[PDB]
Design a protein around this ligand. Structure first.
Ligand code: HEM
Ligand code: HEM
Ligand code: XFN
Ligand code: XFN
Ligand code: H4B
Ligand code: H4B
Ligand code: ZN
Lengths: 404, 403
C-alpha cells in the first residue's frame, strides 16, 4: 500500500490515507518508543525559510504557484528580512493565514466554518486604550445581538527586543473567582490568580458567583492597564430547564461569546501574541466542562439532589443523569434567547463532514482525538470512531506563557 | 527525555521511568502522532527476550543472581541453542500471564492483576481436549456469578507448523444472521463468523440472542465445531428499576467477557490461543454493544418508548436514552447477582492502580482514549489524568484471522 498513515472509520468501515502530515515541518511529543497524545502541555536562518514556506502556501490558495507575482513577493521578503530582520504581512495574506491557522488547530471541532471568519486588522494599534476599543469593536461585531459571528482581531507582532502586546486574561469573558478565608472559592475558580491580579492592579471587586471580569491589557514595555467592559455590551444567558421547573431557580448563567485571548498566533514566522478570536459555544463546554468539573463551578451534586437522586451510591448513575440535564438546560436556555449554540452531536456530525472536505482538498486533517470527541456521550457521536492523525502545521496557534 | 505527567483535577505531577523499559515500537513518531489508531500495520534475539523475561521472574520473587536463576537461565540457553527455542516452567507462565494483563495499556480493570487464575493447557493435542479446557475455564470463571479473573494457555507456537487457534473472538458470543434485505438479525459484528460455523456444519437458530458454537483449531486441522453446554453460560435478562415497560424489550446479555483471539506473548514465546475472562464494566454492555450503530443499535428504539423527540439532536435523546440503557444494565446484574462494575467505581479504582504502579514499577502505561469510558467521560478522574502509552513485555498482541 501507500507509505503514509492509514485511517479507518470503524462505523462506516471506510479508509483514508493522510498525505498532509508529509508537510508537518514541526516535531511533536511522541517518539516511536512512546505516545504522549494525552499530554496537554507539550534569527535569519529559520525565519527566512519559515516565511518562504507561508508565501508558497499563499500563492497556492490563489493558484498562482511559481509565477512572477510569486518570486517577486519572495524577494520582497528576502529584501525586508535581510536588511531589517523582519517583514510585514500584506493584509490579504494575514487574512488567508489567520484562516489557515483555525483550519490547522487540531484540537477544534469547530472547523467546518474555518473559511467563514472575519479578520479585523488591528496592526496599527498603539496604546492600551486603542487596544480596548478595538476589542469592544470585536465583541459588538461578533456578538451581534445573538446571531454570533466568527472573528479575530490582530494586534502587532513581536519585535526584536521591544515590548510584547498582551491581553493578560485568557478570555475576553471570564467570571471572577474569589478565594475564601475557608479555602472554597466564590465564583469560577478557573481564574482566581487573575481575579487576584485584577484587584491588586486597581479593581474594586464584587461579592458574586458570576461577577464579570474586567480586562487586563498591556502595550509594549508599558505597565499593564485595566479596562472594564460596558455591561449592556456583555451578553449573558439565564439558564432554565424545559421540564424541571426548579432549574431556573438555581440562578445559574453563562455568557454568549467564547473569546480566546491568551494565545499566540504564528504565521510565516511572525508572532501575534495578542490576537484574540471567538466563535460560539458547543453546549457541552458550558454544561460539562465549566459547570460540572469539580475543579470549576462543579454544581452536579447540587443539581442531583434537587433531582432526587441517590448519591450515596456511585452506581445509581446520578453523576451522569444530572449532567445530561445540565447540558440540556444549557441548550434549551440558548435556543430560547435566540443565541447561537450547537450541541455535541450536531457539532461532531459536521466536523465529520469537514474531515471529508479536507480529505479531497489537502489530503487529511490533523486531529487530537481526545479533544475532538466530546466530554459526554463520546461513543454516540460519529467522530468517536474516526481514527485521527495529529500533527503540527503552520500557521498555527501556540499556547503561550502568562505575562507575569 | 523522561515524561512529566500532570493530573489536572488535583495538580498531581509525576514522572514515568517505566517507559524506558519499552522494547518494541509504536506507530507514533515525532512528525505525526497516531496514538488513536486501533491496530498496527535471528534466534539469538529470542534468546535475549528470554533472559530479559526470565529476569523479570527471579527478580520478581527476589532471587535474581542466586542459584536457581543462574541455573535456570542456562536450561534456557541450552535449550534455545539446540531446539531453536525453549519452554516455560509453569509458575513462570503464571508470572508471565499476570504481568501481561498488568501491562496491556488498554485495560481499565488492571487493579485486579494480582488476582488471576492460570490454567496450563500446554499439554493439549486436539480440539476435543481444547473444548474441555474451555468448558472447564468458563465453569470456573462464571462461578455462579462471583466472577473470577482467569486465563487459559494452550500450546505455544511451533516454528514451521500450524497454530492452536480459537476462531471465535470471544467465548460466549451472539449469532448474527444476515437477511436478504441487507438486514441483520442479532449481533452484526459476528455476521461473518456465524456463516463460518454454518459452512463448517452448524444448525442456526433465528432468535436475536443465540450463543454461537465454538470453532477450535489445532495445528493444520480444518477447525471443528463444538457446542457450549446450554448452562455453562450465564445470561442476564435486562430490566430498568423504575421503567416498568423496559424488559418487555426482551433484551439480555451474557455474564462472561472472554477473549479468544489475542496472542499472549511471554518472554520470546507466542501463545496463539490463550482465552481470558474477568468481568464486565457496564458501559461495554450498554454503550458499545447495545447502542453502537455498527451493532445491536437499540438507541432510537429505547428513546421512542422513553417518549422523546427523535426529530432533533438538541433534545439530547440519544444521551438521555443511553443513560437508561446503562442504568438497566447495572440494575439487572446486581439483581441477577452477577459481578459488574460501573465506569465510575472502575475508573476510580484504576486511578488508584495508577498510584500503585507509580510507587511500584515507577510508572505504568495506559491508552487514554481507551481507558476513558465512552459515556460521560469527563465525569471520571481518568479523563483529567494524562497518561503515557508504551509497549512492555510480556503482553497481548492482536493476530490475523486464521483465514
Ligand atoms: C465556530 C464555532 C466554534 C466551535 C463550535 C468551536 C469549538 C471548539 C471546542 C469544543 C474546542 C475544544 C476546547 C475545550 O473544550 O477545551 C475547540 C478548540 C479550539 N478551537 Fe474552536 N470552536 C469554534 C470556533 C473557533 C474559532 C473562531 C477559532 C479561532 C480562529 C477556534 C480555534 C480553536 C483553538 C485554537 C482550539 C484549541 C486551542 C487550545 O488548546 O486552547 N475555534 N473549539
Ligand atoms: C477483571 C475485570 C476487568 C475489567 C473491569 C476490565 C475492563 C476492560 C475494558 C472495559 C476494556 C476495554 C474494551 C472496550 O472498551 O471495548 C479492557 C481492555 C482490555 N483488557 Fe480488561 N478488564 C478486566 C479484566 C481483564 C483481564 C482478566 C484481562 C486479561 C488477563 C484483561 C485484559 C485486557 C486486554 C488485553 C484489553 C485490550 C485489548 C483489546 O484491544 O481487546 N482485562 N479491559
Ligand atoms: C491551564 C490551561 C491553560 C491554557 N492556556 N489552556 C488550557 C486548556 C483549556 C482551554 C483554555 C482556554 N482559554 C480556551 C479553551 C478553548 C475554548 C473555546 C474556544 C473557541 C474559539 C470556541 C469554543 N467553542 N471554545 C480551552 C488549560
Ligand atoms: C483484532 C480485533 C478483532 C476484533 N473482533 N475486535 C477488536 C477490538 C477490541 C476488543 C476485542 C474483544 N474481543 C473484546 C474487547 C473487550 C475486552 C474486555 C475483556 C475483559 C476480560 C473485560 C472487559 N471489560 N473487556 C475489545 C480487535
Ligand atoms: C487530561 C486530558 O488529556 C485533558 O484534560 C484534555 C482531554 N480532552 C479535552 N477535550 C476538550 N474538549 N477540552 C479539554 O480541556 C480537554 N482536556
Ligand atoms: C478510534 C478509537 O481509537 C477507537 O474507537 C477506540 C476509542 N475508545 C474506545 N473506548 C472503548 N471503551 N472501547 C473501544 O473499543 C474504543 N475504541
Ligand atoms: Zn502519540
Amino acid at each position: 500500500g501507500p507509505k503514509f498513515p492509514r485511517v479507518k472509520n470503524w462505523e462506516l468501515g471506510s479508509i483514508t490515507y493522510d498525505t498532509l502530515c508529509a508537510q508537518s515541518q514541526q516535531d511533536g511529543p511522541c517518539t516511536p518508543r512512546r505516545c504522549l497524545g494525552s499530554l496537554v502541555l507539550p534569527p535569519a536562518e529559520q525565519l527566512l525559510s519559515q516565511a518562504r514556506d507561508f508565501i508558497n502556501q499563499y500563492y497556492s490558495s490563489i493558484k498562482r504557484s511559481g509565477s512572477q507575482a510569486h518570486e517577486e513577493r519572495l524577494q520582497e521578503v528576502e529584501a525586508e528580512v535581510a536588511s531589517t530582520g523582519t517583514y510585514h504581512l500584506r493584509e490579504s495574506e494575514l487574512v488567508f493565514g489567520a484562516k489557515q491557522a483555525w483550519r490547522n488547530a487540531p484540537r477544534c471541532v469547530g472547523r467546518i466554518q474555518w473559511g467563514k471568519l472575519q479578520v479585523f486588522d488591528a496592526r496599527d494599534c498603539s496604546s492600551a486604550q486603542e487596544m480596548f476599543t478595538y476589542i469592544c469593536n470585536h465583541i459588538k461585531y461578533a456578538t451581534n445581538r445573538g446571531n454570533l459571528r466568527s472573528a479575530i482581531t490582530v494586534f502587532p507582532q513581536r519585535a526584536p527586543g521591544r515590548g510584547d502586546f498582551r491581553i493578560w486574561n485568557s478570555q475576553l469573558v471570564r467570571y471572577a473567582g474569589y478565594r475564601q478565608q475557608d479555602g472554597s472559592v466564590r465564583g469560577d475558580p478557573a481564574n482566581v490568580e487573575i481575579t487576584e491580579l485584577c484587584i491588586q492592579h486597581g479593581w474594586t471587586p464584587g461579592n458574586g458567583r458570576f461577577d464579570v471580569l474586567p480586562l487586563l491589557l498591556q502595550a509594549p514595555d508599558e505597565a499593564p492597564e485595566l479596562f472594564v467592559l460596558p455591561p449592556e455590551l456583555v451578553l449573558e444567558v439565564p439558564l432554565e430547564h424545559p421540564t424541571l421547573e426548579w432549574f431556573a431557580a438555581l440562578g445559574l448563567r453563562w455568557y454568549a461569546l467564547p473569546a480566546v485571548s491568551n494565545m499566540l498566533l504564528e504565521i510565516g514566522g511572525l508572532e501575534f501574541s495578542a490576537a484574540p478570536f471567538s466563535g460560539w459555544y458547543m453546549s457541552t463546554e458550558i454544561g460539562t466542562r465549566n459547570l460540572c468539573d469539580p475543579s470549576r463551578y462543579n454544581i452536579l451534586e447540587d443539581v442531583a439532589v434537587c433531582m432526587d437522586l441517590d448519591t450515596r451510591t456511585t452506581s445509581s448513575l446520578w453523576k451522569d443523569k444530572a449532567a445530561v440535564e445540565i447540558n440540556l438546560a444549557v441548550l434549551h436556555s440558548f435556543q430560547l434567547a435566540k443565541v447561537t449554540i450547537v450541541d455535541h452531536h450536531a457539532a461532531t456530525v459536521s466536523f465529520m463532514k469537514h474531515l471529508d472536505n479536507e480529505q479531497k482538498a489537502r489530503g487529511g486533517c490533523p486531529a487530537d482525538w481526545a479533544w475532538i470527541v466530546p466530554p459526554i456521550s463520546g461513543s454516540l457521536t460519529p467522530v468517536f470512531h474516526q481514527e485521527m492523525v495529529n500533527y503540527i502545521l503552520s500557521p498555527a496557534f501556540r499556547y503561550q506563557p502568562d505575562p507575569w
